[PDB]
Amino acid sequence: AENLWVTVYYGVPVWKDAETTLFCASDAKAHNVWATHCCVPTDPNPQEIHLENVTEEFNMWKNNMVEQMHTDIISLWDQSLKPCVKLTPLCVTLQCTNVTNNITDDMRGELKNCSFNMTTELRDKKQKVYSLFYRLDVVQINNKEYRLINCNTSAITQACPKVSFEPIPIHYCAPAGFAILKCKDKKFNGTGPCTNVSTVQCTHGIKPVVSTQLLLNGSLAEEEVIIRSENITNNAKNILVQLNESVQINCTRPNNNTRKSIRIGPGQWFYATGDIIGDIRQAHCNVSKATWNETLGKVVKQLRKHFGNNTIIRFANSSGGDLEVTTHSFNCGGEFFYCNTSGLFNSTWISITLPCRIKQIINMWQRIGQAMYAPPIQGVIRCVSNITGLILTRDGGSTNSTTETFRPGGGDMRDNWRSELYKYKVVKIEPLGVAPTRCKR
Amino acid sequence: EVQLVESGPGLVRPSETLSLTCAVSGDSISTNNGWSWIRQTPGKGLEWIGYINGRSGSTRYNPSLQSRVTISTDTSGNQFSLKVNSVTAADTAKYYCAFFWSTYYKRFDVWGPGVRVTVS
Amino acid sequence: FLGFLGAAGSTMGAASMTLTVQARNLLSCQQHLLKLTVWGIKQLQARVLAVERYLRDQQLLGIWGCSGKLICCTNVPWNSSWSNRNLSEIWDNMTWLQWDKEISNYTQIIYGLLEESQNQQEKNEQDLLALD
Amino acid sequence: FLGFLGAAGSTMGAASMTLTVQARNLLSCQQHLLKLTVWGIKQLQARVLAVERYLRDQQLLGIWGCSGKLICCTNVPWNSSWSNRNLSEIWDNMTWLQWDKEISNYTQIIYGLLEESQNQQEKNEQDLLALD
Amino acid sequence: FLGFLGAAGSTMGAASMTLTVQARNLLSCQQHLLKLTVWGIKQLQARVLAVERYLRDQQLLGIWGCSGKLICCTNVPWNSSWSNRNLSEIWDNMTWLQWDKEISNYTQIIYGLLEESQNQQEKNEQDLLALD
Ligand SMILES: *[C@@H]1O[C@H](CO)[C@@H](O[C@@H]2O[C@H](CO)[C@@H](O[C@@H]3O[C@H](CO[C@H]4O[C@H](CO)[C@@H](O)[C@H](O)[C@@H]4O)[C@@H](O)[C@H](O[C@H]4O[C@H](CO)[C@@H](O)[C@H](O)[C@@H]4O[C@H]4O[C@H](CO)[C@@H](O)[C@H](O)[C@@H]4O)[C@@H]3O)[C@H](O)[C@H]2NC(C)=O)[C@H](O)[C@H]1NC(C)=O
Ligand SMILES: *[C@@H]1O[C@H](CO[C@@H]2O[C@@H](C)[C@@H](O)[C@@H](O)[C@@H]2O)[C@@H](O[C@@H]2O[C@H](CO)[C@@H](O)[C@H](O)[C@H]2NC(C)=O)[C@H](O)[C@H]1NC(C)=O
Ligand SMILES: *[C@@H]1O[C@H](CO[C@@H]2O[C@@H](C)[C@@H](O)[C@@H](O)[C@@H]2O)[C@@H](O[C@@H]2O[C@H](CO)[C@@H](O)[C@H](O)[C@H]2NC(C)=O)[C@H](O)[C@H]1NC(C)=O
Ligand SMILES: *[C@@H]1O[C@H](CO[C@@H]2O[C@@H](C)[C@@H](O)[C@@H](O)[C@@H]2O)[C@@H](O[C@@H]2O[C@H](CO)[C@@H](O)[C@H](O)[C@H]2NC(C)=O)[C@H](O)[C@H]1NC(C)=O
Ligand SMILES: *[C@@H]1O[C@H](CO)[C@@H](O[C@@H]2O[C@H](CO)[C@@H](O)[C@H](O)[C@H]2NC(C)=O)[C@H](O)[C@H]1NC(C)=O
Ligand SMILES: *[C@@H]1O[C@H](CO)[C@@H](O[C@@H]2O[C@H](CO)[C@@H](O)[C@H](O)[C@H]2NC(C)=O)[C@H](O)[C@H]1NC(C)=O
Ligand SMILES: *[C@@H]1O[C@H](CO)[C@@H](O[C@@H]2O[C@H](CO)[C@@H](O)[C@H](O)[C@H]2NC(C)=O)[C@H](O)[C@H]1NC(C)=O
Ligand SMILES: *[C@@H]1O[C@H](CO)[C@@H](O[C@@H]2O[C@H](CO)[C@@H](O)[C@H](O)[C@H]2NC(C)=O)[C@H](O)[C@H]1NC(C)=O
Ligand SMILES: *[C@@H]1O[C@H](CO)[C@@H](O[C@@H]2O[C@H](CO)[C@@H](O)[C@H](O)[C@H]2NC(C)=O)[C@H](O)[C@H]1NC(C)=O
Ligand SMILES: *[C@@H]1O[C@H](CO)[C@@H](O[C@@H]2O[C@H](CO)[C@@H](O)[C@H](O)[C@H]2NC(C)=O)[C@H](O)[C@H]1NC(C)=O
Ligand SMILES: *[C@@H]1O[C@H](CO)[C@@H](O[C@@H]2O[C@H](CO)[C@@H](O)[C@H](O)[C@H]2NC(C)=O)[C@H](O)[C@H]1NC(C)=O
Ligand SMILES: *[C@@H]1O[C@H](CO)[C@@H](O[C@@H]2O[C@H](CO)[C@@H](O)[C@H](O)[C@H]2NC(C)=O)[C@H](O)[C@H]1NC(C)=O
Ligand SMILES: *[C@@H]1O[C@H](CO)[C@@H](O[C@@H]2O[C@H](CO)[C@@H](O)[C@H](O)[C@H]2NC(C)=O)[C@H](O)[C@H]1NC(C)=O
Ligand SMILES: *[C@@H]1O[C@H](CO)[C@@H](O[C@@H]2O[C@H](CO)[C@@H](O)[C@H](O)[C@H]2NC(C)=O)[C@H](O)[C@H]1NC(C)=O
Ligand SMILES: *[C@@H]1O[C@H](CO)[C@@H](O)[C@H](O)[C@H]1NC(C)=O
Ligand SMILES: *[C@@H]1O[C@H](CO)[C@@H](O)[C@H](O)[C@H]1NC(C)=O
Ligand SMILES: *[C@@H]1O[C@H](CO)[C@@H](O)[C@H](O)[C@H]1NC(C)=O
Ligand SMILES: *[C@@H]1O[C@H](CO)[C@@H](O)[C@H](O)[C@H]1NC(C)=O
Ligand SMILES: *[C@@H]1O[C@H](CO)[C@@H](O)[C@H](O)[C@H]1NC(C)=O
Ligand SMILES: *[C@@H]1O[C@H](CO)[C@@H](O)[C@H](O)[C@H]1NC(C)=O
Ligand SMILES: *[C@@H]1O[C@H](CO)[C@@H](O)[C@H](O)[C@H]1NC(C)=O
Ligand SMILES: *[C@@H]1O[C@H](CO)[C@@H](O)[C@H](O)[C@H]1NC(C)=O
Ligand SMILES: *[C@@H]1O[C@H](CO)[C@@H](O)[C@H](O)[C@H]1NC(C)=O
Ligand SMILES: *[C@@H]1O[C@H](CO)[C@@H](O)[C@H](O)[C@H]1NC(C)=O
Ligand SMILES: *[C@@H]1O[C@H](CO)[C@@H](O)[C@H](O)[C@H]1NC(C)=O
Ligand SMILES: *[C@@H]1O[C@H](CO)[C@@H](O)[C@H](O)[C@H]1NC(C)=O
């Protein structure tokens, strides 16, 4: 008997979960690939709005913003290499020796001096050239004859020696008709409701840093070490540990290198690794022992919280597989390091020097079919970075509560973005609605 | 909850003016619309006189009374009043102060006891 | 962008005062897009969609007889079966997100009725003695 | 899509009752379009055109003073030379397709007159003693 | 295209008579565009932009309560500080280009006030005893 009449409202504050494409924006201030694909500037003072009395459900494991970074990053890598010189002509039988001059025993057998016959700019003329190679990229044919490691598998191209891939913070912004909501609540699990939310135009700046086992240069939690997982009980899943204190790691490549330019064709140059100046030493990373053996103690108390009150926690080494899986894949200065992390996970709870290997022909994790040759860096390099989180894998689940074993794990590229896109959700705005009122035309 | 309290002379002689004041308690006149006067005329029943918007001073009146009736608001006293130009015996009635709320979402009345006024 | 969603936790009645805030925000390089013609398309698709969504809502307001208004009355009665609540339970102590969840299944019934009502109104305007 | 063209054989009068049926139907993958960037363009061109055609008709209704209406009256008299028929020959026993063929050549004359009429009407609204 | 800009040197008053001339001109191969998919994008971007600009102006007229009109009155008073001139100095002996240069800095103040006025007007329509 209410006698009401369906009035119509437009501009109603109602939203629904949705999937759309986000666009990148930058600080303007930033030959770097992300300085060109992230041209639109963000507002210097983002218009964040607190929403009073709003409860919203989040789930970081089903967040499509993560999938978009994966696609955008691999897409750019495959565009940047588009105009550059192919190294197909270098897939020739090589003649190699052992580079034994001024070598540290740790480097014995690591470098090879290889000579070969390759063409010049003229179709009818050849030249004899030589360069140094790392053993990881050179494979013996049937003791002096060697092939490049990927000749029976993939095409090889030279990375453009002009384009920087140094991470730049980028921001993702919503398209018209959409909005991004953020959790500002505390100690968020990564899933479930949060009751302290706000509306934003764009995400905070996120650096597209890619690494394995250890997560570098991210957001450093806030109040405590937080451990997140899709399931925790299921030993097939990863555990992401976010630290509230950073651990400084110092990595270096001690050998002083030079370069030589070899004509590979008309207007096409190949960049080869030249002689090492001075002694030949092994690449490595330094982690302060005084910080690491405390950082894990914090992790253990929080890790025990999910398994038991009086149980033993053991940190073991990594398992078998490719270097991309078993080691810490670290990209720094333009070269690719594969570091041994066993020295960091060798203890039971109840200065550390890590040796590294260097690889130049990179079959990027992203796909099989094409490989990239990374030109050498002149002089020497040093890297300073922040370990901000760990990826652990549970290697137990067995019927013995006495103890449980964790190992370095991960390796999925998305594990490096999921932890930053963690606080955000994309929604669509739907402006029409109806409701009864006591008024008719 | 708004309460309406009224007072004024219960006797007006013919050709003299009529004046009634309604005090408002529980809310502010200056914030609401719908403050109004209605009278109950013996032999006729209830009749609307007019109303005032406390937020503007704008008023509306029953056409039969437009030549004689004034409605106005005391924003200091939080009271409003009805004045009628010279009256006759025909104006004897029970006069009431009322508040009418009518919007798209709510409908309600506040209606006080009134003042009986005889013209003679 | 001073409240794009500020009224989300407000009651349905209170939130009726921000309709221009939400509406004005729903229809907000150089060489890169043409050198790499993947991104020119990705960007255009986002822009075309924002326009199409805007226009579909405007067409409905047109058909229902509510063009140019943010608040519009109709002549379709409310069915008690769509929500058995009185006005004091809807406009106060309830948000628009909650209301939308409650009504959802009846959205198409209501929209169909709004279109029928406007057509009946137009028929009555082609008869000069209408409504008497 | 319940009559997109159901009234096509109906008389002009009878067909006036389906105007919302035709109007509501005139502004109705994933990776393939970006991997093969020929199709992204072919698809966008079709979508952009549908929007531009819609908007041009809406602009004319605006200019002529018929915005928001499906049926609209004007003040331009009908010239007998455009079609020398009475109303009983037009609204009954004739379809819209036949009428369009009959009028076609006079379409622009009529549209020009509709625009002139609205401008004269606006001029008369900037003179507070108008039409007396 | 018979005066796209013919009134540019006319006074503000006289130029008010050509508003339909300017409005009707503000929303006016084959294989080449798909064979060379740089140009398909260059062309679509130009077309999408023309549509977006048109729609933003229409949305503002909607918000301000001037939808469907070329000349519209509002209830916002003119501030003498925006231009200390009387009507005989504005409508006569001045062009629209000159006026725009004079007002420019106050454009956003004025637009904000127009939006506030319409919202106040709507609030007064949800109170059946309004303006009395
Ligand atoms: C986590 O976050 C940290 C912090 O941001 C980040 O570490 C930083 O990494 C970047 C890149 O690896 C480091 O930047 C390099 O620093 C060296 C140091 O040079 C110093 O001394 C020279 C002396 O003249 C000064 O001019 C210079 O300003 C410094 O003081 C620079 O030399 C590097 O620049 C060269 O390489 C660039 C690569 O694109 C070129 O663009 C640039 O023009 C320079 O190259 C030129 O010189 C070369 C010399 O041989 C020549 O070969 C080239 O052709 C060219 O001419 C660069 O600036 C930065 O310092 C690091 N920060 C710290 C504290 O170490 C971590 O990497 C990050 N972790 C991640 C992502 O995992
Ligand atoms: C209010 O609506 C009911 C019908 O709504 C039903 O539930 C809806 C979700 C949807 O499934 C509808 O199709 C359902 O019918 C009206 O009742 C119907 O009235 C017609 C009239 O002839 C009758 O034939 C139907 O059988 C009735 N439905 C039922 C279930 O009895 C009711 O009249 C509506 N009231 C008003 C005021 O509109
Ligand atoms: C009806 O229209 C006629 C003119 O229409 C003619 O045919 C059309 C197809 C097109 O070619 C027009 O340009 C033609 O003129 C009107 O007659 C005209 O009136 C003007 C007035 O001065 C006169 O100068 C023209 O010469 C006339 N044309 C002819 C052919 O005599 C007629 O007045 C219109 N009637 C109404 C009621 O509008
Ligand atoms: C006319 O506008 C003035 C204010 O305009 C000033 O100049 C503009 C360019 C812009 O900078 C404004 O922000 C400036 O304020 C009004 O005067 C203001 O009134 C408010 C009322 O409380 C007062 O607080 C301000 O201080 C006043 N500003 C000044 C400079 O005194 C004036 O009232 C407006 N008149 C009308 C009729 O609207
Ligand atoms: C790699 O092999 C090349 C030769 O194939 C070495 O270069 C020669 O070094 C001797 C040293 O006196 C010179 O006399 C020759 O003229 C060099 N030959 C050429 C062609 O340059 C090179 O030193 C070896 N590199 C290493 C690191 O052992
Ligand atoms: C939501 O989280 C934010 C955290 O950013 C809280 O804001 C802080 O509130 C305290 C209260 O005294 C202030 O001292 C801080 O300065 C605020 N932080 C910022 C960045 O301004 C906010 O109060 C939380 N809201 C709720 C409802 O818990
Ligand atoms: C983690 O995943 C496991 C595996 O699915 C879940 O445990 C199983 O849940 C199903 C539900 O029907 C049961 O039938 C199985 O018996 C469960 N497995 C065991 C070993 O008990 C587990 O609940 C998930 N846990 C979390 C926290 O998500
Ligand atoms: C990382 O370094 C450790 C030691 O520095 C390597 O561990 C050695 O592995 C061989 C393999 O059987 C053992 O015989 C040695 O006793 C191990 N040393 C120690 C101290 O346990 C480990 O293999 C290295 N990892 C990689 C990937 O090279
Ligand atoms: C969030 O909820 C609180 C209460 O649950 C709202 O506060 C009320 O606001 C009305 C406004 O007039 C007051 O009359 C009530 O007394 C307030 N309640 C309390 C307990 O103080 C608050 O406004 C809500 N937020 C929003 C955005 O609506
Ligand atoms: C609106 O639709 C939802 C489903 O989309 C209805 O909820 C379902 O109702 C069936 C009835 O047997 C249940 O079996 C489902 O489990 C319900 N789903 C959920 C998510 O609860 C809902 O009842 C419909 N509302 C109305 C008023 O009809
Ligand atoms: C197709 O034509 C037939 C006749 O040529 C139309 O039928 C007529 O419909 C009217 C409707 O009231 C009746 O009064 C006539 O008596 C019917 N004629 C006959 C011979 O039965 C039919 O409606 C037309 N179809 C359409 C879509 O208009
Ligand atoms: C409307 O235009 C058509 C042509 O587009 C006119 O028909 C033509 O008229 C000329 C006159 O000499 C004939 O020679 C052509 O053969 C006709 N064409 C056809 C297809 O028949 C038609 O007459 C015009 N209608 C009006 C009313 O002017
Ligand atoms: C250009 O300026 C001239 C004068 O400066 C304008 O001519 C005036 O037009 C009005 C129209 O009624 C006449 O009353 C004046 O007497 C004219 N002045 C002179 C000196 O003849 C001319 O119209 C202007 N052009 C435009 C487009 O406005
Ligand atoms: C409108 O803005 C312009 C600038 O965009 C103002 O002109 C400037 O005023 C400052 C005041 O100190 C001068 O220093 C600049 O040189 C002026 N610029 C120019 C180009 O002259 C203009 O005054 C503003 N108008 C109003 C009414 O505020
Ligand atoms: C050549 O390299 C191989 C690598 O295992 C090593 O065993 C061999 O002794 C080296 N030869 C010389 C001369 O050092
Ligand atoms: C280059 O070709 C000649 C041809 O006889 C061969 O003897 C020589 O060993 C080749 N050089 C290399 C480094 O393979
Ligand atoms: C290429 O040759 C190496 C030689 O050991 C072999 O292990 C590898 O599987 C081969 N790759 C392919 C694709 O056959
Ligand atoms: C590492 O952590 C320290 C802690 O304050 C911080 O100041 C520094 O900027 C961090 N470095 C990086 C690369 O984030
Ligand atoms: C990190 O979390 C631990 C948890 O107990 C806390 O004791 C420690 O002080 C925190 N560190 C910082 C920098 O807040
Ligand atoms: C945190 O995630 C774990 C893993 O599924 C879950 O069991 C636990 O209940 C979650 N905590 C909250 C507060 O949702
Ligand atoms: C690591 O520590 C050792 C200790 O002697 C030092 O020699 C080496 O240079 C350090 N490496 C780095 C990268 O600092
Ligand atoms: C990294 O190098 C800086 C250079 O001053 C040094 O202070 C810091 O202690 C080093 N970190 C480690 C882990 O050795
Ligand atoms: C585990 O230890 C913590 C330490 O405060 C305690 O609060 C918690 O209740 C303990 N849990 C059990 C099951 O005893
Ligand atoms: C683990 O620690 C023990 C402690 O003495 C040490 O002997 C062993 O070599 C360590 N393992 C690794 C891989 O460093
Ligand atoms: C080093 O790690 C062991 C692991 O059990 C721990 O007991 C010891 O206390 C740690 N050192 C420090 C300084 O905490
Ligand atoms: C490498 O050695 C050359 C030899 O003079 C020296 O000039 C250069 O600076 C060195 N580069 C380093 C240590 O980065």
Judge whether A233 and A268 are in contact, CB under 8 Å: no
The Cα C119–Cα C127 span in angstroms is: 14
Q: Pick the closest to residue C120 from C69, C76, C77, C56 (CA basis).
A: C76
Q: Return the half-sphere exposure (C-beta side, CA atoms, 13 A cut-off) of residue A290.
A: 1
Amino acid at D109: I
Q: In chain E, what are the domain boundaries?
A: 1-132
Judge whether A360 and A148 are in contact, CB under 8 Å: no
CA of A49 vs chain B CAs: smallest distance (Å): 29
What are the φ/ψ torsions at residue A342 (nearest 5 degrees)? Answer: -60, -30
Q: Which helix (H) or strand (E) holds B11?
A: strand B11-12
Give D57: exposed, middle or buried? Use CB within 10 Å, 0-12, 13-18, 19+. Answer: exposed
Judge whether A393 and A239 are in contact, CB under 8 Å: yes
The Cα A83–Cα C90 span in angstroms is: 63
Judge whether A191 and A58 are in contact, CB under 8 Å: yes
The alpha-carbon radius of gyration of chain E (Å, integer) is 20
DSSP labels, D24-41: TTS---TTHHHHSTTHHH
Q: Which two tokens stand for residue A308?
A: 């038991």
The Cα D94–Cα D76 span in angstroms is: 23
> Chain E: residue nearest D61 by CA?
E68
Q: Which helix (H) or strand (E) holds C116?
A: helix C107-123
Judge whether B43 and B33 are in contact, CB under 8 Å: no
E60 touches chain D (CB under 8 A): no
DSSP labels, E41-99: HHHHHHHHHHHHHHHHHHHHHHHHT-TT-SS---SPPPPGGG----HHHHSSS--HHHH
First to last CA, chain B: 37
- DSSP letter for E125, please: T
Q: Chain B partners of E126 at a C-beta cutoff of 8 Å?
A: 103-105
Q: Return the half-sphere exposure (C-beta side, CA atoms, 13 A cut-off) of residue A279.
A: 8
The Cα A303–Cα A228 span in angstroms is: 10
Judge whether A314 and A299 are in contact, CB under 8 Å: no
Amino acid at A166: E
Give D31: exposed, middle or buried? Use CB within 10 Å, 0-12, 13-18, 19+. Answer: exposed
User: What is the sign of the dihedral through the CA atoms of B54, B60, B64 and B67?
Assistant: positive
CA distances from residue C16 to C72, C102, E60 in whole angstroms, order as listed: 12, 18, 19
Interchain CB distance below 8 Å, C38 and D41 = no
Q: Other CB atoms closer than 10 Å to residue B68's CB: what's the count? A: 16
Judge whether B36 and B73 are in contact, CB under 8 Å: no
**Beta strand segments in A325-378, E:** 328-332, 335-339, 347-349, 352-359, 361-362, 370-373
Whether D and B touch, i.e. at least 3 CB pairs below 8 A, reads as no
Q: Other CB atoms closer than 10 Å to residue A361's CB: what's the count? A: 20
DSSP labels, A69-97: HHHHHHHHHHHHTTTSPB-GGG-S-EEEE
Q: Pick the closest to residue A79 from A160, A170, A175, A169 (CA basis).
A: A160
Judge whether A247 and A328 are in contact, CB under 8 Å: no
Question: Is the CB–ligand 24 distance for residue A343 below 6 Å?
Answer: yes
What are the φ/ψ torsions at residue D126 (nearest 5 degrees)? Answer: -110, 35
Q: Which helix (H) or strand (E) holds A130?
A: strand A126-134
Judge whether B26 and B3 are in contact, CB under 8 Å: yes
- Measured in whole angstroms, how far is the alpha carbon of residue A168 from the centre of its chain? 13
Judge whether A223 and A186 are in contact, CB under 8 Å: yes
Judge whether A157 and A85 are in contact, CB under 8 Å: yes
Q: Which two tokens stand for residue D27?
A: 């502004």
Give A384: exposed, middle or buried? Use CB within 10 Å, 0-12, 13-18, 19+. Answer: exposed
Q: Pick the closest to residue E126 from D33, A181, D49, C91 (CA basis).
A: C91
Q: Which helix (H) or strand (E) holds C59?
A: helix C39-64
The angle formed by the CA atoms of residues A148, A152 and A157, to the nearest 5 degrees, is 60
- DSSP letter for D89, please: H
Give A77: exposed, middle or buried? Use CB within 10 Å, 0-12, 13-18, 19+. Answer: middle
C70 touches chain A (CB under 8 A): yes
The Cα A223–Cα A144 span in angstroms is: 58
Helices (H), D1-132: 19-23, 32-35, 39-64, 87-90, 96-103, 107-123
- DSSP letter for A164, please: B
Using a 6 Å CB cutoff, which residues line ligand 5?
A 99, 101, 113, 115, 130, 275
Give A213: exposed, middle or buried? Use CB within 10 Å, 0-12, 13-18, 19+. Answer: buried
CA distances from residue A287 to A37, A101, A187, A218, A416 in whole angstroms, order as listed: 35, 30, 28, 18, 21
CA distances from residue A268 to A89, A271, C44, D8 in whole angstroms, order as listed: 12, 10, 36, 68
Residue of D42, D52, D122 lying closest to E51 (CB–CB) = D52
Q: Which region holds residue A266: left if phi is over 0, alpha if psi is between -120 and 50, else beta?
A: beta
Q: Whose CA is nearest to atom 36 of ligand 4?
A: E79
Q: Pick the closest to residue B30 from B9, B10, B54, B8 (CA basis).
A: B54
Experimental approach: cryo-EM
Residue A267 contacts by C-beta under 8 Å, 6 or more apart in sequence? none
Q: Which residues pair with A348 in a beta bridge?
A: A314
Q: Which helix (H) or strand (E) holds A217?
A: none
**Residue for token pair 């006759």:** B88
SS3 C118: helix
Return the biggest CA–CA distance within chain E: 69
**Residue for token pair 């009707």:** E24
- DSSP letter for A43, please: P
Q: Chain B partners of A3 at a C-beta cutoff of 8 Å?
A: none
Q: Strand A15-17 to strand A268-277: parallel, antiparallel, or no bridges (unpaired)?
A: unpaired
Q: Whose CA is nearest to atom 1 of ligand 20?
A: A189
What are the φ/ψ torsions at residue A16 (nearest 5 degrees)? Answer: -130, 150
Q: Which residues pair with A206 in a beta bridge?
A: A170
Q: Pick the closest to residue C3 from C32, C23, C33 (CA basis).
A: C23
Q: Which residues of A139-151 are buried (b: 16+ CB within 10 A; e: fewer)?
A: eeeeeeebebbbe
Give A82: exposed, middle or buried? Use CB within 10 Å, 0-12, 13-18, 19+. Answer: exposed
Q: Chain E partners of B52 at a C-beta cutoff of 8 Å?
A: 132
Q: Pick the closest to residue D21 from D34, D36, D6 (CA basis).
A: D6
CA of B11 vs chain E CAs: smallest distance (Å): 30
Judge whether D63 and D106 are in contact, CB under 8 Å: no
Interchain CB distance below 8 Å, B102 and E129 = yes
Q: Other CB atoms closer than 10 Å to residue A85's CB: what's the count? A: 20
Centroid of ligand 12 to alpha carbon of A159 (angstroms): 69
**Residue for token pair 């004689």:** B68
Q: Which two tokens stand for residue A206?
A: 């996120």
Q: Which residues of A34-66 are buried (b: 16+ CB within 10 A; e: fewer)?
A: bbbbbbeebeeeeeebebeebebebebeebebb
Centroid of ligand 16 to alpha carbon of A115 (angstroms): 9
The Cα A174–Cα A194 span in angstroms is: 21
- Measured in whole angstroms, how far is the alpha carbon of residue A25 from the centre of its chain? 20
SS3 A138: strand
E57 touches chain C (CB under 8 A): no
> Chain C: residue nearest B105 by CA?
C87
C19 touches chain A (CB under 8 A): yes
Q: Which residues pair with A424 in a beta bridge?
A: A182
Q: Chain E partners of D44 at a C-beta cutoff of 8 Å?
A: 44
The Cα E103–Cα E111 span in angstroms is: 12
User: What is the sign of the dihedral through the CA atoms of A107, A109, A115 and A120?
Assistant: negative
CA distances from residue B50 to A162, B3, B18, B86, C55 in whole angstroms, order as listed: 84, 19, 15, 17, 46
Contacts 24+ apart (CB under 8 A), A149-155: A149/A361, A150/A361, A150/A363, A150/A371, A151/A91, A153/A363, A153/A368, A153/A371, A154/A363, A154/A368, A154/A369, A154/A370, A154/A371, A155/A86, A155/A88, A155/A369, A155/A370, A155/A371
Centroid of ligand 17 to alpha carbon of A370 (angstroms): 15
Using a 6 Å CB cutoff, which residues line ligand 18?
A 217, 246, 385-386
Q: Strand A126-134 to strand A226-229: parallel, antiparallel, or no bridges (unpaired)?
A: unpaired
Amino acid at A81: L
The Cα C37–Cα E40 span in angstroms is: 10
Judge whether D26 and D55 are in contact, CB under 8 Å: no
Q: Which helix (H) or strand (E) holds C57?
A: helix C39-64
The Cα E62–Cα C27 span in angstroms is: 13
Judge whether A429 and C26 are in contact, CB under 8 Å: yes
Judge whether B14 and B90 are in contact, CB under 8 Å: no
Chains contacting chain A through 3 or more C-beta pairs under 8 A:
B, C
E129 touches chain B (CB under 8 A): yes
Judge whether E91 and E14 are in contact, CB under 8 Å: no
Q: Which region holds residue C35: left if phi is over 0, alpha if psi is between -120 and 50, else beta?
A: alpha
The Cα A115–Cα A128 span in angstroms is: 7
Judge whether A74 and A366 are in contact, CB under 8 Å: yes
Judge whether A351 and A173 are in contact, CB under 8 Å: no
- DSSP letter for A100, please: -
CA distances from residue D30 to A62, A69, C34, D33, D35 in whole angstroms, order as listed: 19, 16, 21, 7, 10
Centroid of ligand 2 to alpha carbon of C79 (angstroms): 9
The Cα E19–Cα C109 span in angstroms is: 42
Amino acid at B49: I
Cα-based torsion angle of the residue sequence E3, E4, E10, E13 in order, rounded to the nearest 10 degrees: 100
Q: Strand A145-148 to strand A94-97: parallel, antiparallel, or no bridges (unpaired)?
A: antiparallel
Q: Which two tokens stand for residue A235?
A: 């030993």
The Cα A218–Cα A385 span in angstroms is: 10
The angle formed by the CA atoms of residues A413, A419 and A423, to the nearest 5 degrees, is 135
The Cα A441–Cα A65 span in angstroms is: 46
Interchain CB distance below 8 Å, E126 and B103 = yes
Q: Pick the closest to residue D40 from C56, E33, A21 (CA basis).
A: E33
The Cα C79–Cα C87 span in angstroms is: 13
The Cα A156–Cα B16 span in angstroms is: 111
Q: Other CB atoms closer than 10 Å to residue A281's CB: what's the count? A: 18
The Cα A264–Cα A86 span in angstroms is: 9
The Cα C99–Cα C96 span in angstroms is: 5
The Cα A267–Cα E22 span in angstroms is: 55
Give D132: exposed, middle or buried? Use CB within 10 Å, 0-12, 13-18, 19+. Answer: exposed
For the beta sheet containing A7-10, the strands, ordered from the edge strand earlier in sequence to the opposite edge, are: A432-435, A7-10, C71-72
Judge whether A180 and A42 are in contact, CB under 8 Å: no
Amino acid at A324: E
Q: Other CB atoms closer than 10 Å to residue B97's CB: what's the count? A: 27
Q: Which two tokens stand for residue A242?
A: 């976010």
- DSSP letter for A415, please: G
CA distances from residue E39 to A404, B100, C40 in whole angstroms, order as listed: 62, 67, 11
Q: Which of residues 83-112 of B touch A (CB under 8 A)?
A: 104-105, 107
Give B1: exposed, middle or buried? Use CB within 10 Å, 0-12, 13-18, 19+. Answer: exposed
Amino acid at C107: T
Q: Helix E39-64 vs helix D39-64: angle between axes, to the nearest 10 degrees?
A: 30
CA distances from residue D32 to A64, A76, B5, C33, E36 in whole angstroms, order as listed: 19, 18, 78, 19, 18
The Cα E67–Cα E60 span in angstroms is: 8
The Cα A166–Cα A34 span in angstroms is: 8
The Cα C64–Cα C121 span in angstroms is: 10
